[PDB]
Design an enzyme around this catalytic site. Structure first.
Site, PDB file in Angstrom:
ATOM      1  CG  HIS A  41      58.671 -17.272 -91.590  1.00  0.00           C
ATOM      2  ND1 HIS A  41      59.034 -17.587 -90.300  1.00  0.00           N
ATOM      3  CD2 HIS A  41      57.494 -16.606 -91.514  1.00  0.00           C
ATOM      4  CE1 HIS A  41      58.110 -17.127 -89.479  1.00  0.00           C
ATOM      5  NE2 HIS A  41      57.168 -16.525 -90.188  1.00  0.00           N
ATOM      6  N   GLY A 142      50.135 -13.272 -87.859  1.00  0.00           N
ATOM      7  CA  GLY A 142      50.782 -11.961 -87.914  1.00  0.00           C
ATOM      8  C   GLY A 142      51.641 -11.617 -86.722  1.00  0.00           C
ATOM      9  CB  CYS A 144      56.126 -14.197 -87.195  1.00  0.00           C
ATOM     10  SG  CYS A 144      55.348 -15.805 -87.361  1.00  0.00           S
TER      11      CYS A 144
HETATM   12  C1  LIG Z   1      53.675 -15.712 -88.014  1.00  0.00           C
HETATM   13  O1  LIG Z   1      52.876 -14.631 -87.489  1.00  0.00           O
HETATM   14  C2  LIG Z   1      53.991 -15.538 -89.486  1.00  0.00           C
HETATM   15  O2  LIG Z   1      54.899 -16.196 -89.969  1.00  0.00           O
HETATM   16  N1  LIG Z   1      53.208 -14.707 -90.197  1.00  0.00           N
HETATM   17  C3  LIG Z   1      53.253 -14.642 -91.643  1.00  0.00           C
HETATM   18  C4  LIG Z   1      51.904 -14.202 -92.165  1.00  0.00           C
HETATM   19  C5  LIG Z   1      51.125 -15.042 -92.978  1.00  0.00           C
HETATM   20  C6  LIG Z   1      49.885 -14.570 -93.438  1.00  0.00           C
HETATM   21  C7  LIG Z   1      49.429 -13.273 -93.097  1.00  0.00           C
HETATM   22  C8  LIG Z   1      50.204 -12.432 -92.292  1.00  0.00           C
HETATM   23  C9  LIG Z   1      51.437 -12.919 -91.832  1.00  0.00           C
HETATM   24  C10 LIG Z   1      52.941 -17.033 -87.784  1.00  0.00           C
HETATM   25  C11 LIG Z   1      52.508 -17.181 -86.310  1.00  0.00           C
HETATM   26  C12 LIG Z   1      51.679 -18.421 -86.049  1.00  0.00           C
HETATM   27  C13 LIG Z   1      50.293 -18.373 -86.675  1.00  0.00           C
HETATM   28  C14 LIG Z   1      49.338 -18.821 -85.577  1.00  0.00           C
HETATM   29  N2  LIG Z   1      50.129 -18.751 -84.380  1.00  0.00           N
HETATM   30  C15 LIG Z   1      51.397 -18.538 -84.608  1.00  0.00           C
HETATM   31  O3  LIG Z   1      52.257 -18.479 -83.781  1.00  0.00           O
HETATM   32  N3  LIG Z   1      53.765 -18.152 -88.274  1.00  0.00           N
HETATM   33  C16 LIG Z   1      53.288 -19.103 -89.101  1.00  0.00           C
HETATM   34  O4  LIG Z   1      52.143 -19.189 -89.515  1.00  0.00           O
HETATM   35  C17 LIG Z   1      54.236 -20.124 -89.610  1.00  0.00           C
HETATM   36  C18 LIG Z   1      54.561 -19.606 -91.000  1.00  0.00           C
HETATM   37  C19 LIG Z   1      55.750 -20.323 -91.561  1.00  0.00           C
HETATM   38  C20 LIG Z   1      56.989 -20.136 -90.956  1.00  0.00           C
HETATM   39  C21 LIG Z   1      58.102 -20.785 -91.453  1.00  0.00           C
HETATM   40  C22 LIG Z   1      57.954 -21.610 -92.556  1.00  0.00           C
HETATM   41  C23 LIG Z   1      56.708 -21.794 -93.161  1.00  0.00           C
HETATM   42  C24 LIG Z   1      55.594 -21.152 -92.665  1.00  0.00           C
HETATM   43  N4  LIG Z   1      53.690 -21.477 -89.674  1.00  0.00           N
HETATM   44  C25 LIG Z   1      53.395 -22.203 -88.587  1.00  0.00           C
HETATM   45  O5  LIG Z   1      53.511 -21.784 -87.443  1.00  0.00           O
HETATM   46  C26 LIG Z   1      52.915 -23.625 -88.830  1.00  0.00           C
HETATM   47  C27 LIG Z   1      54.038 -24.508 -89.413  1.00  0.00           C
HETATM   48  C28 LIG Z   1      54.224 -25.792 -88.615  1.00  0.00           C
HETATM   49  C29 LIG Z   1      55.447 -26.066 -87.985  1.00  0.00           C
HETATM   50  C30 LIG Z   1      55.604 -27.253 -87.253  1.00  0.00           C
HETATM   51  C31 LIG Z   1      54.544 -28.168 -87.145  1.00  0.00           C
HETATM   52  C32 LIG Z   1      53.328 -27.897 -87.780  1.00  0.00           C
HETATM   53  C33 LIG Z   1      53.168 -26.715 -88.508  1.00  0.00           C
END
Ligand SMILES: *[C@@](O)(C(=O)NCc1ccccc1)[C@H](C[C@@H]1CCNC1=O)NC(=O)[C@H](Cc1ccccc1)NC(=O)/C=C/c1ccccc1
Length: 301
Positions: A41, A142, A144
């Site tokens: 993603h 960040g 991920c």
């Molecule tokens: C990751 O760190 C990530 O994807 N980072 C991308 C990024 C975005 C903006 C600035 C820098 C990097 C992150 C980790 C989360 C954040 C808080 N704690 C964590 O573990 N992942 C996400 O935010 C994902 C992003 C995403 C992935 C796949 C598809 C769409 C978005 N989102 C979520 O974790 C929330 C989605 C969700 C899933 C199931 C139920 C509710 C919400």
């Protein structure tokens, strides 16, 4: 003596982490040989609406990647997509690649998460893969791509987790390195809720053996309960089944207390500690595998 939930040293893995940028989105990659694996993603267009990954990948242009490590440049040569991960091929082979293998966690397994941001390791911690295929971790924006791993005695890194998502509960999900998401959750912004988390009975048993071996015995019941009886009780009370009693033979031996007796003690202890503690904990603790207890109490020479 003592029982701490510890992480295996992170050094061999630290040097495999890299910053992966796509467009303005930034997350972590794991560089082994000439491949950076990372969550797919990174190329997603946006969070709010469902993502067509097929489309995103077909329309994905290499020129918007920027893979760095400590400021240094890794060139992208190409990119394949495998489940929820990308395998970015790159121009340099990671000279610090450790002897490694990819291994997929079953629930109950324990592993180490190296929490990384911008391709830099910030923390490390041990964690158990829960029955509902989530972990309880600490990850902000960040994180991920943060890898999880175990290290065998031969120094072999088992890479087994790549952080992907945080469910609405706060529970954390990732994939293995083949891209299969743990517990068949989806790496999408969707409404997914995790099954109920069960107490990992095996780990509770090992905990209690540890408590014994650390002179903590106040809780110990004169009741014995066989495995089938326990397992039946467990279903009803939010606990897993318990594995073959022979697994614990070393600790049975060293304490002279049978599993059967600990299973029974688990049942009474389920009802609360009465303000007393067991090795500091105020309710039953399933943080520790058998292997962790054995290693921590006996496992040098
Ligand atoms: C990751 O760190 C990530 O994807 N980072 C991308 C990024 C975005 C903006 C600035 C820098 C990097 C992150 C980790 C989360 C954040 C808080 N704690 C964590 O573990 N992942 C996400 O935010 C994902 C992003 C995403 C992935 C796949 C598809 C769409 C978005 N989102 C979520 O974790 C929330 C989605 C969700 C899933 C199931 C139920 C509710 C919400």
């Amino acid at each position: 003596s003592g029982l701490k939930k510890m992480a295996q040293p992170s050094g061999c893995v630290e040097r495999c982490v890299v910053r992966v940028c796509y467009g303005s989105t930034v997350l972590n990659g794991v560089w082994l040989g000439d491949t950076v694996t990372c969550p797919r993603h990174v190329i997603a267009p946006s969070t709010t609406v469902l993502i067509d990954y097929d489309h995103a990948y077909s329309t994905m242009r290499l020129h918007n990647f920027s893979v760095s490590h400590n400021g240094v440049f890794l060139g992208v040569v190409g990119v394949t997509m495998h489940g929820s991960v990308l395998r970015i091929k790159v121009s340099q082979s990671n000279v610090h690649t450790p002897k490694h293998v990819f291994k997929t966690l079953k629930p109950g397994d324990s592993f180490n998460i190296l929490a990384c941001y911008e391709g830099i390791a910030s923390g490390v911690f041990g964690v158990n893969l829960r029955t509902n295929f989530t972990i309880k971790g600490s990850f902000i924006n960040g994180a991920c791509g943060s890898p999880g791993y175990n290290v065998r005695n031969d120094g072999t890194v088992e890479f087994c987790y790549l952080h992907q998502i945080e469910l609405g509960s706060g529970a954390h999900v990732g994939s293995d390195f083949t891209g299969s998401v743990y517990g068949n959750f989806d790496d999408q912004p969707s409404l997914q809720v995790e099954s109920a988390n069960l107490m990992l009975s095996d780990n509770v048993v090992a905990f209690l053996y540890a408590a014994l071996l650390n002179g903590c015995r106040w809780w110990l019941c004169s009741t014995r309960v066989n495995v089938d009886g326990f397992n039946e009780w467990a279903m009803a009370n939010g606990y897993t089944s318990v594995s073959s009693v022979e697994c614990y033979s070393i600790l049975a031996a060293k304490t002279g207390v049978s599993v059967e007796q600990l299973l029974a003690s688990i049942q009474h202890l389920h009802e609360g500690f009465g303000g007393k503690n067991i090795l500091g904990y105020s309710s039953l603790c399933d943080e520790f595998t058998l292997a962790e207890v054995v290693k921590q109490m006996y496992g040098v020479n």
